[PDB]
Amino acid sequence: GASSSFKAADLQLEMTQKPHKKPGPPLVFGKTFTDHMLMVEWNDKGWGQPRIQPFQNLTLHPASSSLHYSLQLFEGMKAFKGKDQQVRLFRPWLNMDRMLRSAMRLCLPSFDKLELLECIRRLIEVDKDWVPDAAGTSLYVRPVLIGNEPSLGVSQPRRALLFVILCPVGAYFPGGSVTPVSLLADPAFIRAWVGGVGNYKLGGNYGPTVLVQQEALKRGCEQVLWLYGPDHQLTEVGTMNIFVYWTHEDGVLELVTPPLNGVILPGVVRQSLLDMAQTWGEFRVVERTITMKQLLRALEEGRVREVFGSGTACQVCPVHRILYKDRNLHIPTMENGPELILRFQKELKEIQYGIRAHEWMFPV
Amino acid sequence: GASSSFKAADLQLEMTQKPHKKPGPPLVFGKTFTDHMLMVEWNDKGWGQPRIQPFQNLTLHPASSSLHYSLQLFEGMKAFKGKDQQVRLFRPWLNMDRMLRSAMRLCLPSFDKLELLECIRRLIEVDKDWVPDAAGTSLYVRPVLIGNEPSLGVSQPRRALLFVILCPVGAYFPGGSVTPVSLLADPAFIRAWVGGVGNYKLGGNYGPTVLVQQEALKRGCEQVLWLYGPDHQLTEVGTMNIFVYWTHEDGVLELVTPPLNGVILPGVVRQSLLDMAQTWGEFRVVERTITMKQLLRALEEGRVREVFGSGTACQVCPVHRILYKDRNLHIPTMENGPELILRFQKELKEIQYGIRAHEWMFPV
Ligand SMILES: *Cc1c(COP(=O)(O)O)cnc(C)c1O
Ligand SMILES: *Cc1c(COP(=O)(O)O)cnc(C)c1O
């Protein structure tokens, strides 16, 4: 059908008459929600008006395509409150771009990126007192678009819902340090494949990972290292992008991450780390496949400095151990500082919390 | 956690006070629903009691894991009403087995197969007058299990819902004949992969196929032929299993379907066709990979008799054309009768509608 969008200019506001009490000083990820949400409905008449409304349950027809055929996508981004109580979102335009790409892949309706962003801004503004301001804390923003056609046909939905909910989040690390994780690298489990949809933030990519994460824990590891292809390409760690800081086989010190060739989700943090490192101009920055054979050889030769994951949840997450083919591989990230990881963490903290002004931050 | 199940002995019944009018003489697949549904809730206290209740909307928390991370699975099976008004389900035990396998893969709670089946039986019994009895018609039964934890953690759900809804379905073919379809075979699109979850009936497998089906239609084809691997293995057609009746390269007449090696959904119809053909003992019946190279050579040599899909929707669906690498390949299914397809259709019709007694049918 023809494209159309809702407009922020049309936003309707209904304030809660029953606010929840705000948390004390233990923000467990994803279990505590704020007082309001955004909601917009789409059908054959286009989008309705956007509304901010009290946090409340969804009412869905039992045949809703969202629940049968996974016509569902989401985003995640963080807002941060500085010491002056100004709230700012980190590169939210990138998340909007990604959400629209996801929507098109599932034949869900398009909308105007900047109108959604302005609605999100207004929502956060209404719930601004829910954004924590202790060091390292944040507000997680969770936009969702679902198909909502009351039909068991596997087909393009004629109805959809877009909604956004918000969660306060606690700190992951003490100021100025990081704590590493151990990974399970089992080639039997495949997250994504070329020709598939692992490069979109679709619900369907995440459910099948629950059992695998439980196998990692059973095995004494914290997260999953996702391997791909017959050469055991390192793709992602958990729900994070993977980076390696090493001297490569050609003798050149570089930061490498896998290229966007279909099996990598294009992270916002990932893009930001690449951008920052390119701007410093201190070492080579490249997008290239990384194989277990290359890593094993680099480790034995002492060429690896730091391996880490990146994503909205911890920002940068160091790795100290990989369990592969029943071999426990020590990764010397913490013995190398981890200088690069701490550098990234510091620069992101300064930008996100407004210690210095930067074009990446969108004020609320 | 420890396993437990709901019991049919505990079923609660609430009859509708506002029945819907039943359809006239146009049953469009999946859009018309019956007066009641089954519902069972699970949490940390185990399963609640099962209930038959009037058809109504679901009320879900906006953070429900079913909508964010695709913690969702479903089944599909048919009930058939004979000319004596007896209603019978086709091999429903197989669907129960498959549903439990799906549940375990997504870390959703197990339940007792026969208790669910007995509840389903009771539901169909309450809505028995909704089962059509015109030739070729049926009642589709749609069990669903979803995670329902109000949490944005990607984790094993601590709450779930199991529900079943029912749809009357019309006939697909006139009695005693079949109509063929054209397929798009584009190796760029991959349904499933070894190491993945394409062998389970999980919602997440279906949403990404909507865009691909639209590309097939844009290309002048009706359904998608799903190819896998660098040798272009024929895996599935649409949401159906694929069968080929041919003289193989060794000179032997056989019926072949791809083996259950991770990328094939184990269809109930598929299993039934294999069982029937094995019981006749007239030709070789084998599970072997089928490649496009083999098919192309077989076609040019005149060795192909019939290619068809199998599944609960049409039972057997003949193929007459495959568009591959921009070549339109004629498939001579209709020129060969299609004798085998008509044989299968007749034998299934006799069993499903109770013309002859058979252990595959479960009386309601
Ligand atoms: C969300 C996600 C990432 C990280 O994306 P960010 O935008 O940096 O938060 C990486 N990989 C997967 C698989 C993800 O879902
Ligand atoms: C449901 C389905 C089938 C067919 O299964 P039946 O049990 O015969 O209805 C085959 N392939 C896919 C991908 C399916 O979803």
Author numbering:
A (entry chain A), B (entry chain A): 0 to 24, 27 to 365
Give sentences copied directly from the paper behind this entry.
BCAT2 is the human mitochondrial enzyme that degrades branched chain amino acids (Val, Ile, Leu) into branched chain α-keto acids (BCKAs). A second product of the reaction is glutamate, which is neurotoxic, allowing tumor expansion in the brain at the expense of normal brain cells. Our first identified potential target for GBM was branched-chain amino acid aminotransferase (BCAT) 2 T186R (UniProt, PDB: BCATM T159R). There are several BCAT2 structures determined, each with two molecules found in an asymmetric unit forming a biological assembly.
Here, we present the first BCAT2 T186R variant structure with a novel trigonal crystal lattice, with only one molecule in the asymmetric unit. The biological assembly, the dimer, is formed over a 2-fold crystallographic symmetry axis. The T186R amino acid substitution is found close to the interface of the dimer. No structural difference is observed at position 186. The CB and CG2 (methyl) carbons of threonine 186 are almost perfectly overlapping with the same carbons in the arginine side chain in the BCAT2 T186R structure. Less than 6 Å away from the T186R mutant, the side chain of K59 from the symmetry-related BCAT2 monomer is found. One can speculate that repulsion of these amino acid side chains may destabilize the BCAT2 T186R dimer. Destabilization of the BCAT2 dimer may affect the enzymatic activity of the BCAT2 variant depending on the pH of the environment, yielding altered enzyme kinetics. The crystallographic experiments confirm the hypothesis generated by in silico structural homology modeling as detailed in Lichti et al.. Synergistic data were obtained by FT-ICR MS/MS and X-Ray crystallographic studies, providing both confirmation of the sequences of the expressed proteins and demonstrating differences in crystallization patterns due to a single amino acid substitution.
